[PDB]
Protein backbone atom coordinates (compact mmCIF):
# COMPACT_ATOMS: atom_id res chain seq x y z
CA UNK A 1 0.00 0.00 0.00
CA UNK A 2 2.86 2.33 -0.82
CA UNK A 3 1.95 5.92 -1.61
CA UNK A 4 2.33 6.85 -5.27
CA UNK A 5 5.56 8.88 -5.78
CA UNK A 6 3.95 12.17 -6.80
CA UNK A 7 6.86 13.96 -5.14
CA UNK A 8 9.07 12.68 -7.98
CA UNK A 9 7.06 14.87 -10.34
CA UNK A 10 5.67 17.83 -8.43
CA UNK A 11 8.68 18.25 -6.14
CA UNK A 12 11.17 17.62 -8.95
CA UNK A 13 14.26 19.81 -9.16
CA UNK A 14 14.24 19.72 -12.97
CA UNK A 15 11.51 20.01 -15.60
CA UNK A 16 11.39 19.14 -19.28
CA UNK A 17 11.15 21.54 -22.17
CA UNK A 18 7.67 21.68 -23.70
CA UNK A 19 8.93 20.18 -26.98
CA UNK A 20 9.81 16.93 -25.16
CA UNK A 21 7.59 16.25 -22.14
CA UNK A 22 9.11 13.94 -19.54
CA UNK A 23 6.66 11.12 -19.01
CA UNK A 24 6.67 9.00 -15.87
CA UNK A 25 4.52 5.95 -15.32
CA UNK A 26 2.50 5.57 -12.13
CA UNK A 27 1.51 2.01 -11.19
CA UNK A 28 1.19 -0.51 -8.36
CA UNK A 29 0.56 2.15 -5.72
CA UNK A 30 -1.94 4.12 -3.68
CA UNK A 31 -2.72 7.49 -5.22
CA UNK A 32 -3.73 10.57 -3.29
CA UNK A 33 -5.24 13.33 -5.36
CA UNK A 34 -6.93 15.01 -2.42
CA UNK A 35 -3.61 16.26 -1.13
CA UNK A 36 -3.03 18.02 -4.44
CA UNK A 37 -6.56 19.35 -4.65
CA UNK A 38 -6.60 20.81 -1.15
CA UNK A 39 -3.04 22.17 -1.16
CA UNK A 40 -4.40 25.38 -2.71
CA UNK A 41 -0.86 25.86 -4.04
CA UNK A 42 -1.91 25.45 -7.65
CA UNK A 43 -2.95 28.30 -9.89
CA UNK A 44 -5.19 25.92 -11.81
CA UNK A 45 -6.73 22.55 -11.04
CA UNK A 46 -9.12 21.50 -13.80
CA UNK A 47 -10.35 18.20 -15.17
CA UNK A 48 -11.92 16.93 -18.37
CA UNK A 49 -12.37 13.52 -16.80
CA UNK A 50 -14.02 12.43 -13.57
CA UNK A 51 -14.30 15.23 -11.02
CA UNK A 52 -11.28 15.25 -8.64
CA UNK A 53 -13.42 14.66 -5.57
CA UNK A 54 -14.66 11.37 -7.04
CA UNK A 55 -11.49 10.61 -8.98
CA UNK A 56 -9.72 9.57 -5.80
CA UNK A 57 -12.11 6.64 -5.37
CA UNK A 58 -11.79 5.43 -8.96
CA UNK A 59 -9.17 2.78 -9.73
CA UNK A 60 -7.11 2.69 -12.95
CA UNK A 61 -4.79 0.21 -14.64
CA UNK A 62 -2.35 2.93 -15.66
CA UNK A 63 -1.73 6.55 -14.76
CA UNK A 64 0.81 8.74 -16.54
CA UNK A 65 2.33 11.99 -15.35
CA UNK A 66 3.71 14.28 -18.03
CA UNK A 67 5.76 17.19 -16.67
CA UNK A 68 6.85 20.31 -18.59
CA UNK A 69 7.23 24.14 -18.48
CA UNK A 70 5.16 26.70 -20.48
CA UNK A 71 4.05 30.35 -20.38
CA UNK A 72 1.00 30.93 -18.20
CA UNK A 73 -1.07 32.10 -21.18
CA UNK A 74 -0.26 28.84 -22.99
CA UNK A 75 -2.00 26.83 -20.28
CA UNK A 76 -5.34 27.54 -21.96
CA UNK A 77 -4.15 25.47 -24.94
CA UNK A 78 -4.01 22.28 -22.90
CA UNK A 79 -7.46 20.87 -23.47
CA UNK A 80 -9.21 18.50 -25.92
CA UNK A 81 -10.28 20.20 -29.15
CA UNK A 82 -7.74 23.03 -28.84
CA UNK A 83 -5.39 24.44 -31.45
CA UNK A 84 -2.29 26.66 -31.27
CA UNK A 85 1.49 26.41 -31.27
CA UNK A 86 1.59 24.24 -28.18
CA UNK A 87 -1.60 22.29 -28.80
CA UNK A 88 -0.67 21.38 -32.37
CA UNK A 89 3.13 21.18 -32.50
CA UNK A 90 4.28 20.26 -28.99
CA UNK A 91 1.53 18.16 -27.41
CA UNK A 92 -2.07 17.14 -28.09
CA UNK A 93 -4.89 15.64 -26.04
CA UNK A 94 -7.51 13.33 -27.69
CA UNK A 95 -11.19 14.30 -27.84
CA UNK A 96 -11.89 11.26 -25.64
CA UNK A 97 -9.29 12.28 -23.05
CA UNK A 98 -9.91 11.43 -19.41
CA UNK A 99 -7.79 13.18 -16.80
CA UNK A 100 -6.68 16.44 -15.22
CA UNK A 101 -4.39 19.41 -15.83
CA UNK A 102 -2.59 21.06 -12.92
CA UNK A 103 -0.59 24.31 -13.15
CA UNK A 104 1.83 25.92 -10.67
CA UNK A 105 3.60 29.31 -10.85
CA UNK A 106 7.34 28.69 -11.00
CA UNK A 107 8.58 32.23 -11.56
CA UNK A 108 10.25 32.14 -8.14
CA UNK A 109 12.29 29.07 -9.11
CA UNK A 110 12.67 29.03 -12.89
CA UNK A 111 13.42 32.72 -13.38
CA UNK A 112 17.03 33.87 -13.74
CA UNK A 113 18.45 37.40 -13.58
CA UNK A 114 19.77 37.22 -17.15
CA UNK A 115 16.63 35.30 -18.18
CA UNK A 116 16.13 31.54 -18.47
CA UNK A 117 16.81 30.25 -21.97
CA UNK A 118 17.14 26.57 -21.07
CA UNK A 119 13.52 25.80 -21.92
CA UNK A 120 12.72 25.17 -25.59
CA UNK A 121 9.45 24.90 -27.53
CA UNK A 122 8.74 23.66 -31.03
CA UNK A 123 7.97 26.53 -33.37
CA UNK A 124 7.79 24.72 -36.71
CA UNK A 125 6.32 21.44 -37.91
CA UNK A 126 5.14 20.08 -41.28
CA UNK A 127 1.83 18.84 -39.82
CA UNK A 128 -0.26 18.68 -36.64
CA UNK A 129 0.62 16.10 -33.97
CA UNK A 130 -1.40 12.97 -33.32
CA UNK A 131 -2.75 12.72 -29.73
CA UNK A 132 0.05 11.85 -27.28
CA UNK A 133 2.63 12.04 -30.09
CA UNK A 134 6.12 13.03 -28.97
CA UNK A 135 8.87 14.22 -31.31
CA UNK A 136 12.38 14.95 -30.10
CA UNK A 137 14.04 15.28 -33.49
CA UNK A 138 16.12 18.39 -34.15
CA UNK A 139 16.21 18.15 -37.95
CA UNK A 140 16.14 21.46 -39.79
CA UNK A 141 12.69 22.56 -40.92
CA UNK A 142 12.24 23.31 -44.61
CA UNK A 143 10.01 26.29 -45.34
CA UNK A 144 9.87 26.47 -49.12
CA UNK A 145 9.91 24.61 -52.43
CA UNK A 146 13.72 24.60 -52.50
CA UNK A 147 15.11 21.43 -50.81
CA UNK A 148 16.88 22.17 -47.55
CA UNK A 149 20.51 21.03 -47.47
CA UNK A 150 20.32 20.59 -43.69
CA UNK A 151 22.19 23.84 -43.08
CA UNK A 152 20.34 26.42 -41.01
CA UNK A 153 20.03 29.87 -42.60
CA UNK A 154 17.06 30.70 -44.85
CA UNK A 155 13.82 28.72 -45.01
CA UNK A 156 15.93 26.24 -43.08
CA UNK A 157 15.16 26.85 -39.44
CA UNK A 158 16.01 25.04 -36.26
CA UNK A 159 12.53 23.72 -35.27
CA UNK A 160 12.96 24.62 -31.61
CA UNK A 161 12.84 28.08 -30.04
CA UNK A 162 13.95 29.26 -26.61
CA UNK A 163 11.62 30.91 -24.12
CA UNK A 164 12.21 34.51 -23.07
CA UNK A 165 11.42 33.77 -19.41
CA UNK A 166 12.46 36.63 -17.11
CA UNK A 167 11.61 37.50 -13.44
CA UNK A 168 10.10 40.82 -14.55
CA UNK A 169 7.70 39.28 -17.07
CA UNK A 170 3.97 39.91 -16.80
CA UNK A 171 2.01 36.99 -15.38
CA UNK A 172 0.94 35.62 -18.77
CA UNK A 173 4.62 35.43 -19.75
CA UNK A 174 5.85 33.89 -16.49
CA UNK A 175 6.85 30.19 -16.53
CA UNK A 176 4.46 27.66 -15.08
CA UNK A 177 5.16 24.10 -14.11
CA UNK A 178 2.41 21.97 -15.49
CA UNK A 179 1.54 18.36 -14.87
CA UNK A 180 -0.94 16.46 -16.97
CA UNK A 181 -2.38 13.31 -15.47
CA UNK A 182 -3.60 10.84 -18.05
CA UNK A 183 -5.77 7.93 -17.01
CA UNK A 184 -6.69 4.73 -18.80
CA UNK A 185 -8.50 1.45 -18.30
CA UNK A 186 -6.89 -1.49 -20.07
CA UNK A 187 -8.14 -5.07 -20.08
CA UNK A 188 -6.31 -5.81 -16.83
CA UNK A 189 -6.81 -5.57 -13.01
CA UNK A 190 -6.40 -2.01 -11.75
CA UNK A 191 -3.16 -1.23 -9.96
CA UNK A 192 -3.70 2.39 -8.93
CA UNK A 193 -6.33 3.34 -6.36
CA UNK A 194 -6.96 6.01 -3.72
Amino acid at each position, epitope marked *: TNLCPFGEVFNATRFASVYAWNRKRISNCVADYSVLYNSASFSTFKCYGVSPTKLNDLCFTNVYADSFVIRGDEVRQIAPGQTG*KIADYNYKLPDDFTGCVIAWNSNNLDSKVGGNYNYLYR*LFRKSNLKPFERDISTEIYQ*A*G*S*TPC*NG*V*E*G*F*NC*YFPL*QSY*GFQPTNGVGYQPYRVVVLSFELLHAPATVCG
Partner: antibody
Amino acid sequence: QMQLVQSGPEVKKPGTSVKVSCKASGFTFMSSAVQWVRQARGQRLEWIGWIVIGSGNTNYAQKFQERVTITRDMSTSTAYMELSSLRSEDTAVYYCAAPYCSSISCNDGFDIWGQGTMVTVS
Amino acid sequence: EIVLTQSPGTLSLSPGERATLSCRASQSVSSSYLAWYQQKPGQAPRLLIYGASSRATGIPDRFSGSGSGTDFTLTISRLEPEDFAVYYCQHYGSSRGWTFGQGTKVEIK
Protein backbone atom coordinates in the same frame (compact mmCIF):
# COMPACT_ATOMS: atom_id res chain seq x y z
CA GLN B 1 -4.39 40.54 -52.45
CA MET B 2 -1.26 40.51 -50.32
CA GLN B 3 -0.02 43.88 -49.10
CA LEU B 4 2.75 45.38 -47.01
CA VAL B 5 1.99 48.83 -45.63
CA GLN B 6 4.70 51.08 -44.26
CA SER B 7 4.63 54.21 -42.11
CA GLY B 8 4.98 57.53 -43.92
CA PRO B 9 7.98 59.92 -44.22
CA GLU B 10 9.76 61.19 -41.12
CA VAL B 11 12.47 63.77 -40.39
CA LYS B 12 14.95 63.44 -37.50
CA LYS B 13 17.89 65.32 -36.03
CA PRO B 14 21.39 63.73 -36.12
CA GLY B 15 22.23 61.72 -33.01
CA THR B 16 18.58 60.74 -32.49
CA SER B 17 16.57 57.61 -33.32
CA VAL B 18 13.89 56.83 -35.94
CA LYS B 19 11.23 54.11 -35.92
CA VAL B 20 9.73 52.53 -39.06
CA SER B 21 6.76 50.14 -39.19
CA CYS B 22 5.59 47.59 -41.79
CA LYS B 23 2.17 45.92 -41.50
CA ALA B 24 1.21 42.67 -43.25
CA SER B 25 -2.25 42.03 -44.67
CA GLY B 26 -3.87 39.02 -46.39
CA PHE B 27 -1.07 36.70 -45.20
CA THR B 28 -0.29 34.74 -42.08
CA PHE B 29 2.50 36.70 -40.44
CA MET B 30 3.92 33.63 -38.68
CA SER B 31 4.53 31.89 -42.00
CA SER B 32 7.58 33.98 -42.94
CA ALA B 33 10.58 36.04 -41.93
CA VAL B 34 10.65 39.78 -42.75
CA GLN B 35 13.77 41.55 -44.06
CA TRP B 36 14.90 45.18 -44.25
CA VAL B 37 16.94 47.05 -46.89
CA ARG B 38 17.65 50.72 -47.62
CA GLN B 39 18.31 52.78 -50.72
CA ALA B 40 20.02 56.16 -50.63
CA ARG B 41 19.15 58.36 -53.58
CA GLY B 42 21.17 57.31 -56.65
CA GLN B 43 22.67 54.33 -54.77
CA ARG B 44 22.57 50.53 -54.86
CA LEU B 45 20.42 48.58 -52.42
CA GLU B 46 22.07 48.00 -49.05
CA TRP B 47 20.90 45.17 -46.79
CA ILE B 48 20.39 46.05 -43.12
CA GLY B 49 19.22 42.95 -41.30
CA TRP B 50 16.23 40.68 -40.80
CA ILE B 51 13.91 39.06 -38.31
CA VAL B 52 12.50 35.56 -38.28
CA ILE B 53 8.89 35.86 -37.27
CA GLY B 54 7.97 33.91 -34.17
CA SER B 55 11.63 33.06 -33.50
CA GLY B 56 12.92 36.45 -32.42
CA ASN B 57 16.17 35.84 -34.33
CA THR B 58 17.40 39.33 -35.15
CA ASN B 59 20.94 38.95 -36.49
CA TYR B 60 22.09 42.08 -38.36
CA ALA B 61 24.57 42.99 -41.09
CA GLN B 62 27.98 43.77 -39.63
CA LYS B 63 27.87 47.33 -41.00
CA PHE B 64 24.77 48.05 -38.90
CA GLN B 65 25.72 45.97 -35.89
CA GLU B 66 24.43 47.68 -32.72
CA ARG B 67 23.10 50.56 -34.83
CA VAL B 68 19.77 48.97 -35.73
CA THR B 69 17.13 47.02 -33.82
CA ILE B 70 14.40 44.88 -35.42
CA THR B 71 11.30 43.70 -33.54
CA ARG B 72 7.77 42.50 -34.29
CA ASP B 73 4.33 42.73 -32.72
CA MET B 74 2.54 39.45 -33.35
CA SER B 75 -0.87 40.82 -32.35
CA THR B 76 -0.80 43.45 -35.10
CA SER B 77 1.11 41.38 -37.66
CA THR B 78 3.55 44.27 -37.91
CA ALA B 79 7.33 44.39 -38.28
CA TYR B 80 9.25 47.27 -36.70
CA MET B 81 12.72 48.68 -37.26
CA GLU B 82 14.63 51.27 -35.27
CA LEU B 83 17.88 53.05 -36.07
CA SER B 84 20.08 54.82 -33.52
CA SER B 85 22.79 57.49 -33.68
CA LEU B 86 21.51 58.79 -37.01
CA ARG B 87 23.80 60.64 -39.41
CA SER B 88 23.00 62.80 -42.44
CA GLU B 89 24.61 59.92 -44.35
CA ASP B 90 21.65 57.72 -43.36
CA THR B 91 19.15 59.70 -45.43
CA ALA B 92 17.46 57.02 -47.54
CA VAL B 93 14.28 55.18 -48.46
CA TYR B 94 13.82 52.15 -46.21
CA TYR B 95 11.89 49.04 -47.32
CA CYS B 96 10.41 45.93 -45.78
CA ALA B 97 9.93 42.76 -47.82
CA ALA B 98 8.55 39.24 -47.47
CA PRO B 99 7.73 35.93 -49.25
CA TYR B 100 4.05 35.20 -49.88
CA CYS B 101 2.20 31.87 -49.78
CA SER B 102 -0.69 30.31 -47.88
CA SER B 103 -0.27 27.49 -45.33
CA ILE B 104 3.10 26.13 -46.47
CA SER B 105 5.39 29.14 -47.14
CA CYS B 106 6.13 27.63 -50.58
CA ASN B 107 7.78 30.67 -52.14
CA ASP B 108 11.49 31.13 -51.43
CA GLY B 109 11.68 34.56 -53.05
CA PHE B 110 10.36 37.94 -51.92
CA ASP B 111 6.97 38.34 -53.49
CA ILE B 112 5.81 41.47 -51.73
CA TRP B 113 7.53 44.76 -50.95
CA GLY B 114 6.21 47.75 -49.01
CA GLN B 115 5.83 51.18 -50.60
CA GLY B 116 8.91 52.31 -48.66
CA THR B 117 9.52 54.91 -45.95
CA MET B 118 11.53 58.05 -46.53
CA VAL B 119 13.83 59.01 -43.69
CA THR B 120 15.69 62.29 -43.73
CA VAL B 121 18.35 63.26 -41.23
CA SER B 122 19.28 66.92 -40.71
CA GLU C 1 30.70 38.04 -46.57
CA ILE C 2 29.92 37.25 -50.20
CA VAL C 3 30.54 40.24 -52.45
CA LEU C 4 28.86 40.40 -55.83
CA THR C 5 30.03 42.32 -58.90
CA GLN C 6 27.86 43.07 -61.92
CA SER C 7 28.41 44.15 -65.49
CA PRO C 8 27.92 46.16 -67.67
CA GLY C 9 27.03 48.88 -65.17
CA THR C 10 25.00 50.51 -67.94
CA LEU C 11 23.57 48.89 -71.07
CA SER C 12 22.05 50.48 -74.16
CA LEU C 13 19.67 48.31 -76.20
CA SER C 14 16.95 48.83 -78.77
CA PRO C 15 13.38 47.68 -77.93
CA GLY C 16 12.79 44.12 -79.11
CA GLU C 17 16.52 43.36 -78.76
CA ARG C 18 17.68 40.36 -76.73
CA ALA C 19 19.46 41.30 -73.49
CA THR C 20 21.80 39.68 -70.98
CA LEU C 21 22.98 40.88 -67.56
CA SER C 22 25.92 39.31 -65.74
CA CYS C 23 26.97 38.80 -62.13
CA ARG C 24 30.11 37.30 -60.63
CA ALA C 25 30.91 36.38 -57.03
CA SER C 26 34.11 37.62 -55.37
CA GLN C 27 34.54 34.10 -53.99
CA SER C 28 33.23 30.55 -54.37
CA VAL C 29 29.62 31.34 -53.50
CA SER C 30 27.59 28.34 -52.33
CA SER C 31 24.78 26.75 -54.37
CA SER C 32 22.41 29.05 -56.26
CA TYR C 33 20.42 31.69 -54.41
CA LEU C 34 20.99 34.54 -56.86
CA ALA C 35 17.44 35.83 -57.10
CA TRP C 36 16.89 38.69 -59.55
CA TYR C 37 14.84 41.85 -59.09
CA GLN C 38 13.57 44.71 -61.28
CA GLN C 39 13.24 48.33 -60.11
CA LYS C 40 11.77 51.53 -61.53
CA PRO C 41 12.33 55.01 -59.99
CA GLY C 42 9.78 55.85 -57.31
CA GLN C 43 8.92 52.15 -56.89
CA ALA C 44 9.97 49.18 -54.77
CA PRO C 45 12.08 46.42 -56.42
CA ARG C 46 10.07 43.45 -57.71
CA LEU C 47 11.01 39.77 -57.83
CA LEU C 48 11.55 38.28 -61.28
CA ILE C 49 13.62 35.13 -60.77
CA TYR C 50 14.27 33.05 -57.67
CA GLY C 51 16.93 30.34 -57.37
CA ALA C 52 18.49 32.05 -60.42
CA SER C 53 16.58 29.44 -62.39
CA SER C 54 12.82 29.79 -61.85
CA ARG C 55 10.27 32.45 -62.68
CA ALA C 56 8.23 34.10 -59.94
CA THR C 57 4.47 33.71 -60.21
CA GLY C 58 3.00 36.04 -62.85
CA ILE C 59 6.34 36.59 -64.62
CA PRO C 60 6.27 36.55 -68.50
CA ASP C 61 8.02 33.74 -70.37
CA ARG C 62 10.67 36.05 -71.82
CA PHE C 63 12.49 36.22 -68.46
CA SER C 64 14.90 33.47 -67.40
CA GLY C 65 17.88 33.03 -65.09
CA SER C 66 21.01 30.98 -65.80
CA GLY C 67 24.57 30.12 -64.78
CA SER C 68 26.25 28.33 -61.87
CA GLY C 69 29.14 28.53 -59.40
CA THR C 70 30.55 32.04 -59.28
CA ASP C 71 28.99 33.06 -62.60
CA PHE C 72 25.28 33.91 -62.79
CA THR C 73 23.32 35.70 -65.50
CA LEU C 74 19.85 37.02 -66.28
CA THR C 75 18.41 36.95 -69.76
CA ILE C 76 15.43 38.45 -71.52
CA SER C 77 14.51 36.87 -74.85
CA ARG C 78 13.38 40.25 -76.24
CA LEU C 79 13.12 43.63 -74.51
CA GLU C 80 9.75 45.30 -74.12
CA PRO C 81 9.60 49.11 -73.53
CA GLU C 82 8.37 48.05 -70.07
CA ASP C 83 11.59 46.11 -69.42
CA PHE C 84 13.90 49.09 -69.33
CA ALA C 85 14.76 49.26 -65.66
CA VAL C 86 17.41 49.00 -62.96
CA TYR C 87 18.17 45.37 -62.09
CA TYR C 88 19.55 43.79 -58.92
CA CYS C 89 20.57 40.38 -57.64
CA GLN C 90 20.73 38.96 -54.12
CA HIS C 91 22.42 35.97 -52.48
CA TYR C 92 20.38 34.45 -49.65
CA GLY C 93 23.12 31.96 -48.78
CA SER C 94 23.32 30.34 -45.35
CA SER C 95 22.49 33.69 -43.73
CA ARG C 96 24.96 36.34 -42.63
CA GLY C 97 24.58 37.22 -46.32
CA TRP C 98 21.81 38.72 -48.45
CA THR C 99 24.25 41.13 -49.97
CA PHE C 100 23.09 42.90 -53.10
CA GLY C 101 25.21 43.41 -56.17
CA GLN C 102 25.87 46.90 -57.53
CA GLY C 103 23.05 46.36 -60.04
CA THR C 104 22.80 47.34 -63.69
CA LYS C 105 20.80 49.89 -65.65
CA VAL C 106 19.26 49.28 -69.06
CA GLU C 107 18.67 52.30 -71.32
CA ILE C 108 16.72 52.71 -74.57
CA LYS C 109 18.75 52.94 -77.78
